[PDB]
Write a protein that binds this ligand. Structure first.
Ligand SMILES: NC(=O)c1ccc[n+]([C@@H]2O[C@H](COP(=O)([O-])OP(=O)(O)OC[C@H]3O[C@@H](n4cnc5c(N)ncnc54)[C@H](OP(=O)(O)O)[C@@H]3O)[C@@H](O)[C@H]2O)c1
Lengths: 1379, 48, 48, 49
């Protein structure tokens, strides 16, 4: 054994711990203007002067990476500054984080005079004309910028954000960031912008106030100003100029939300249309029959071939073969199944386990050691039986969740105890846990699997494994009396020799009020028998009064139900699969000792609040068998969500509900009235929630929506191609196009100034250019494109060839998205396809030749006989350039990659000789071209290559030569040249000319049109890809493995030449869009989610908003947002009224229809009075019920009348998860939120549009009930799915983590702290070391003992002295955290 | 709560008392010992 | 942007050498050596 | 030397090398010159004093 190495100590009390208060979407980040200070301090250190006495100026600061801070960690960064020139480099390890030029000076560097301003101009202004720190940093939070109290410098600002009050606390990294926040606050939007280039940053501490005195609590505020003319954010002695940012994909802090469908599910014998019915598709019913035939004939083969009598249970097999014949070659049987299995017609069962396992059973040879070997064989493929469509029909996520949650609603404890007896043969944990029990948030669960031996497959599940004999009663451990709330007997009672003894002994394990779940074969009992014949030892089971067990181990479904009923078991649920298994959920009848109390809660004015309150108070002083029945006999009633909230403060022991839906109640409606007949049947089951809807008793359950359904594609008349994830070409899909509304999204801002005349064309072919691939794969962000495309739905595709509104065949270039099925092409960009080209050929011409003419005749000014050098002659732009150049009689030099490209060009253009071709592999063309031009050079250079090829290209220019650089992958220095106006950016000029369509474009329009007539513009060779291979087409273009135009085929050209385009539909993903000519009412839209949702609609098409509030604009955040909509070009109207009487409702719709036809009604209004149910009077119970029960039926009555009914498109009524989970103290809100959901379900019954989001918690606009609040940018992503869906109510909530058991979690925490203690010592694997070895034996020394003690105090309640620490063991540590 | 580092370069001369021309004092005796395996760590004084 | 200053920086001169930018500060002197179509355009413009 | 490799086993390429002054040697004298190279970008600077 380069310049200053800075260490950032992110420790508990380190002075720079404030740097952890700067996060972006959760990740902690070093501020972009934090390397400026490091460079600033480094330069001063080199000069030897104090950094706060040096005035620096950083220019063209490039931010290459993000320095990820880590709490309690040390980050070392190296700053290298070149002595004389000032080139600096902030680099962590061997990775660059910041680059630029830092220059000091003694004169005045600051341009603006802001450093001289003394006071704050925001004095005396009203509170509705100012932005405060809460409002300023609510806007940043919505965009992902999470600033802690240290970085919240802007203490006040104007609505325009031009004037601000910036806090000065002596920390320069904070101060510089807060001056960059002013620039961010000057660009309202929704996306997250990551700074990438700061053109100038001037810091002049000499004019800056000195550091505040030590220990200061109140800091001074320095006036700040934003200059739009010069783009300078100036405050105090700092100035940031022309900061450039790059769009960043917003990452999700939490795990994806859990979307559910809050729907009704019958209890017993569900019909095929119900959600609790078995998911037996027509395909499955065939596989079941095929397996049945294969099983039946296989047994016949077994019997005849069993000449050695090595097939015990032979009489049983004969009996099984007999019944199959009662209800009825082996080569054909396998043939039918193999045809089903090997077919890939889309209708494809997930797997074929029964066939696979059956084949092993029969194909095995009949010889010695047969059954022992075959028993082992099937026990090795046991998984096939478990995971089979026939077996999984009753194990579907819907049914499993219905059973598990229905039980949870009725168990009146905090921990749900489950017990799966016989978990080795028929398992249920592998289904109950991942499908229903992992979604629990309010109720804890304990799962206990048991069997004769160790359950091998349950080792990975949060379950407890017990040991005893399941197949023999009378030996069940006595420790299992009143032990489980739910008992699961999947394929267990079919193995018991004595059912009555087994059921009698099993019923003792059920707690008083517990449930019993039984899954057994009930139909086609001879199908699975072949497997059980050779997998079961003693196939003998006594029958009984219900009949004789089929074979010796099977009861029929009808006999199963009768057997259970005979032992006084109430049939809570019964779901017959129909093809095989059946399911019964049973609980013992409940015999009241005191007459139940019935209170009718039908009234929506809450004339019963006094009676319920009185009877709810006397719950904890009555007999345990007393019940309170809240009964509703109307479709509109909040009893269901009302009870859930009451249960939170009165327990589920005595509260019960009954709702009868009048609209869907069958011809025989129930008659629940005191001493009725139907009621007594309900007082015996004693279920918490009983709902009679669709003719059957059931309950409302939230059925999970698979993540695959969120991207389900449905037919759509208008679609367009976009990406699901930016920067990924494999994520390209087809989304709904806003053109279904006639217009195109992105009519805001600059797109409002150019009133171009557009012709609506039906796209038939779409050409793929390299411009689309560059955008699709993330090489360039959308922000580099013309500013008129910022709000467009997509940016992919420009050229096309289709049919205009009159049926004529036309081709042209349009602003994106032209990779769609319909476009609005300006009439000044549309050419007519000659009656010799198919529309396939027309799709290749427009862009390739329009660019060629622009490069040659518009930018290069090519003259006759001039020499032109064209890079990448095989590209479509290259081929067009050669054709244009040849027409001008030019001397052409072109770069060809390989010999194939040279051959293609020579054949395509006979005028081209071998002397006209060079190689793109190396810069050997410079000498060749220079020699061939006799030193004159090339007049025009169409440059696409970069690096040394670009340098060698310019070196060939003549004295008057022109250099047309159209490459897309420009270097950082080149981009800065573009920003500084040093060079023109010609790579998105054809896209810019298409937005203006002015004199320069019409020159290219005429040039191309003339070329077509004169024969110069000929179609290029192309490869046609279907609409579903869009991803492959993009990959083909990117690779550039072969020359040609890639053209997506949208439609099939008709034989005729002028004919209307047939109407057709395309599979596409949902994308909600709002009609710009219709008015959208947002009642309560002037709030947190109201204003942020309104902004979402504005981007998706809405341009006519009428926002309603009780007070109108009352804060500077609302005034700033509304002024942002109006600037964008949105016709906003804020009404200070409450829609609670018909007069108020009329006014809101008078103003709406004045602006345009009503096309959407949104009700985000909320009023909350959280209080205990017993301390609430009617005037306080009806507080939340106005915005949810009076404003929803005054907007529903007005939306069911003309003219709103026909024009209306959306009817969104926001709700809360209180109607599905309940909450403490919000019993009035729950009633309001439930009645709102019943109105929205009535709308669906009448075929009207309706959407009812049921949100848990929203972050931007913590952990409550063990549910993380969602980020808003994700709320709008699921909201978009909610609107474009058929269900009414959708529940969206985020889980902190998938629920584990109780002991399971407890042990997890134990292992966590144990490992923390072990690492304090330095042991990677705590379990590896001996549990009886003292700490002193390892080397614990003073410092570690204190660390261990502090860790224990911070982790658990233990407080251990240092001395005992060095003499206690790990086993001791574990046993003491347990105590 | 700790100590502060210092610098010294001292030295002394010892001689038999019978042949010494100057006697600041007399060395009655000096001895050394070790702490051993203490449970409070190697860098911990042993009072015993 | 017509830059006709004479005291160009080092980077600017390298840009001239690399053909990145045209050197327009000695163009009237260059047109006077050739006296071709470009000059005769200026001759007529001034005469007019 | 920065790369740690021997200079005669390294292939370099210097571009746009500007010579600003002349380093005047002196017989029987010692001339000390500082060379500064930027790690990643390669910007170098031979500067006497
Ligand atoms: N953001 C969350 O935390 C969250 C969580 C779960 C569900 N939600 C759902 O989202 C909505 C709440 O969103 P938010 O509170 O963040 O923003 P918001 O819905 O815009 O706020 C409620 C707004 O409703 C208005 N309002 C109250 N009574 C009204 C009446 N009679 N007529 C007209 N307007 C009335 C109030 O306007 P004034 O203030 O001007 O009177 C208030 O600004 C509810 O639908 C709720 O179910 C929100």
């Amino acid at each position: 054994y380069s310049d200053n190495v800075i260490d950032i100590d992110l420790s508990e009390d380190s002075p720079e711990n404030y740097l952890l208060e700067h996060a972006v979407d959760g990740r902690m980040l070093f501020p972009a203007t934090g390397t400026l200070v490091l460079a600033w301090k480094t330069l001063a250190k080199l000069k030897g002067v104090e950094f706060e006495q040096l005035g620096v100026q950083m220019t063209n600061v490039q931010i290459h990476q993000a320095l990820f801070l880590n709490p309690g960690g040390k980050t070392t960064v190296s700053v290298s500054v070149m002595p004389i020139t000032g080139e600096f480099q902030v680099r962590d390890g061997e990775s660059l984080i910041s680059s630029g030029v830092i220059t000091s000076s003694e004169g005045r560097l600051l341009e603006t005079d802001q450093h001289m301003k003394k006071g704050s101009v925001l004095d005396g202004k009203p509170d509705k004309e100012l932005l405060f720190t809460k409002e300023i940093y609510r806007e940043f939070l919505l965009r992902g910028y999470e600033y802690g109290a240290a970085f919240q410098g802007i203490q006040r600002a104007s609505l325009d954000a031009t004037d601000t009050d910036i806090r000065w606390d002596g920390r320069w990294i904070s101060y510089l960031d807060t001056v960059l926040q002013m620039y961010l606050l000057s660009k309202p939007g929704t996306h997250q912008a990551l700074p990438t280039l700061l053109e100038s940053v001037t810091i002049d501490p000499r004019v800056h106030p000195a550091q505040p005195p030590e220990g200061t609590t109140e800091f001074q505020v320095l006036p700040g100003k934003w200059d739009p003319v010069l783009q300078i954010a100036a405050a105090g002695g700092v100035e940031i100029r022309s900061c450039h940012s790059i769009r960043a994909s917003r990452r999700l802090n939490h795990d994806p939300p859990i979307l559910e469908d809050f729907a009704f599910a019958p209890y017993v014998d569900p019909r095929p249309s119900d959600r609790s019915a078995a998911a037996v598709t027509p395909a499955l019913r065939d596989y079941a029959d095929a397996c049945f035939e294969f099983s039946r004939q296989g047994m016949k083969r077994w019997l005849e071939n069993d000449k050695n009598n090595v097939l015990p249970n032979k009489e049983e097999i004969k009996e099984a073969l007999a019944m199959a014949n009662k209800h009825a070659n082996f080569a054909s049987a396998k043939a039918t199944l193999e045809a089903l299995v090997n077919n890939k017609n889309g209708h494809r069962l997930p797997n074929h386990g029964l066939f696979e396992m059956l084949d092993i059973a029969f194909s095995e040879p009949l010889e010695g050691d047969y059954w022992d070997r075959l028993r082992m064989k099937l026990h090795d493929v046991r998984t096939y039986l478990w995971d089979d469509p026939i077996i999984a029909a009753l194990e579907s996520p819907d049914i499993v969740k219905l059973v598990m949650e229905t039980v949870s609603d009725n168990v009146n404890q905090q921990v749900m105890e489950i017990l799966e007896v016989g978990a080795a043969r028929g398992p249920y944990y592998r289904q109950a846990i991942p499908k229903a029990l992992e979604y629990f948030s309010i109720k804890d669960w304990q799962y206990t699997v048991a069997d004769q031996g160790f359950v091998e497959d349950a080792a990975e599940f949060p379950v407890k494994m017990m040991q005893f004999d399941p197949l023999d009663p009378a030996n069940f451990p006595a420790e299992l009396t009143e032990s489980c709330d739910l008992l699961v007997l999947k394929w267990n009672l079919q193995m018991q020799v004595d059912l009555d003894a087994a059921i009698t002994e099993f019923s003792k394990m059920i707690k008083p009020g517990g449930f019993l779940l039984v899954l057994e074969n009930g139909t086609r009992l001879s199908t699975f028998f072949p497997i059980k014949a050779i997998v079961s030892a003693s196939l003998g089971g006594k029958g009984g009064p219900e009949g004789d067990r089929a074979m010796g181990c099977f009861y029929t479904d009808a006999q199963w139900s009768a057997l259970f009923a005979r032992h006084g078991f109430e049939q809570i649920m019964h779901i017959p699969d129909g093809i095989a298994v059946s399911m019964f959920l049973l609980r013992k009848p409940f015999e009241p000792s005191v007459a139940p109390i019935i209170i009718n809660v039908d009234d929506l004015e809450c004339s019963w609040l006094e009676e319920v309150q009185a009877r709810c108070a006397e719950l904890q002083d009555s007999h345990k068998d007393s019940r309170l029945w809240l009964v509703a006999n109307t479709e509109l009633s909040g009893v269901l969500g009302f009870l859930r909230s009451l249960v939170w403060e009165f327990g589920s022991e005595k509260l019960r509900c009954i709702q009868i839906d009048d609209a869907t109640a069958g011809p025989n409606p129930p008659k629940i009235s005191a001493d009725s007949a139907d009621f007594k049947e309900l007082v015996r089951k004693d279920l918490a929630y009983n709902v009679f809807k669709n003719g059957k008793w059931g309950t409302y359950r939230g059925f999970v929506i698979s993540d695959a359904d969120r991207q389900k594609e449905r037919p759509s008349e208008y679609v367009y191609a976009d990406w699901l994830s930016a920067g990924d070409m494999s994520s390209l899909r087809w989304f709904d196009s806003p053109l279904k509304t006639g217009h195109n999204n992105g009519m805001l801002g600059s797109k409002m100034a150019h009133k171009l005349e557009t012709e609506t064309c039906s796209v038939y072919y779409a050409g793929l250019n390299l411009r689309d691939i560059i955008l699709a794969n993330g090489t360039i962000q959308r922000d580099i494109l013309p500013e008129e495309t910022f709000f467009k739905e997509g940016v992919l595709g420009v050229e096309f060839s289709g049919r205009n509104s009159s049926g004529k065949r036309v081709m042209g270039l349009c602003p994106p998205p032209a990779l769609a099925t319909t476009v609005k092409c300006p009439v000044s960009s549309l050419w007519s396809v000659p009656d010799q080209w198919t529309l396939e050929e027309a799709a290749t011409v427009p862009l390739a030749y329009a660019t060629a003419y622009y490069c040659l005749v518009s930018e290069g000014g090519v003259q006759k006989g001039a020499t032109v050098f064209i890079h990448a002659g095989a590209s479509v732009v290259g081929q067009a350039s050669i054709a244009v150049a040849l027409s001008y009689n030019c001397e052409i030099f072109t770069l060809t990659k390989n010999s194939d490209e040279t051959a293609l060009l020579k054949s395509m253009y006979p005028q081209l000789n071998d002397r006209n071709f060079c190689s793109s592999e190396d810069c050997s063309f410079e000498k060749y071209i220079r020699k061939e031009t006799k030193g004159s050079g090339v007049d025009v250079v169409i440059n696409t290559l970069r690096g040394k090829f670009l340098k060698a290209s310019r070196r060939l220019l003549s004295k008057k030569g022109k250099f047309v650089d159209i490459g897309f992958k420009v270097d950082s220095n080149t981009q800065i040249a573009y920003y500084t106006r040093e060079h023109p950016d010609l790579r998105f000029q054809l896209d810019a000319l298409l937005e203006s369509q002015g004199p320069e474009w019409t020159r290219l329009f005429d040039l191309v049109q003339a070329g077509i007539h004169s024969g110069v513009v000929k179609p290029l060779k192309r490869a046609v890809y279907s609409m579903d291979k869009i991803v492959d087409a993009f990959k083909t273009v990117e690779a550039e493995r072969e020359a040609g135009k890639i053209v997506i085929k949208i439609r099939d050209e008709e034989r005729q030449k002028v004919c209307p385009t047939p109407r057709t539909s395309f599979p596409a993903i949902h994308r909600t869009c709002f009609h710009p000519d219709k008015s959208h009412i947002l009642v309560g839209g002037m709030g947190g989610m109201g204003l942020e949702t309104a902004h979402w609609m504005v981007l998706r098409g809405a341009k006519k908003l009428i926002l309603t509030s009780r007070y109108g604009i009352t804060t500077g955040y609302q005034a700033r947002k509304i002024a942002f909509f109006k600037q964008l070009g949105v016709e906003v109207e804020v009404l200070a009224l409450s829609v609670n009487t018909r007069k108020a409702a009329d006014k809101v719709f008078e103003h709406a229809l004045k602006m345009g036809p009503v096309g959407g009604i949104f009700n985000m209004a909320m009023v909350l009075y959280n209080d205990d149910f017993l301390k609430m009077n009617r005037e306080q119970f009806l507080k939340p019920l106005e915005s949810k029960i009076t404003m929803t039926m005054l907007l529903d009555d007005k939306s069911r009348e003309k003219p709103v009914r026909d024009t209306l498109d959306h009817f969104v009524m926001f709700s809360s998860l209180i109607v599905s989970g309940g909450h403490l103290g919000q019993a009035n809100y729950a009633f309001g939120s439930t009645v709102l959901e019943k109105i929205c379900e009535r709308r669906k019954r009448d075929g009207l549009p309706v959407t009812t989001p049921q949100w848990a918690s929203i972050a931007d606009v913590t952990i409550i009930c063990r549910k993380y609040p969602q980020r808003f940018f994700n709320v709008l992503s699921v909201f978009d799915f909610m609107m474009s869906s058929d269900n009414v109510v959708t529940i969206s909530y985020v889980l902190v983590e998938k629920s584990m058991g109780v002991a399971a979690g407890e042990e997890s925490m134990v292992d966590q702290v144990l490992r923390a203690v072990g690492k304090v010592l330095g042991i990677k694997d705590v379990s590896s070391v001996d549990g009886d070895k003292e700490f002193i034996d390892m080397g614990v020394d003073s410092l570690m003992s204190v660390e261990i003690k502090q860790a224990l105090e911070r982790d658990a309640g233990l407080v251990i002295s240092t001395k005992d620490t060095q003499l206690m063991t790990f086993n001791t540590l574990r046993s003491m955290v347990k105590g | 709560d700790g100590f502060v580092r210092g610098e010294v370069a001292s030295a002394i001369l010892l001689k038999k008392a019978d042949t010494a021309k100057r006697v600041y004092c007399t060395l009655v005796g000096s001895m050394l010992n070790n702490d051993g395996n203490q449970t409070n760590g190697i860098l911990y004084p042993n009072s015993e």
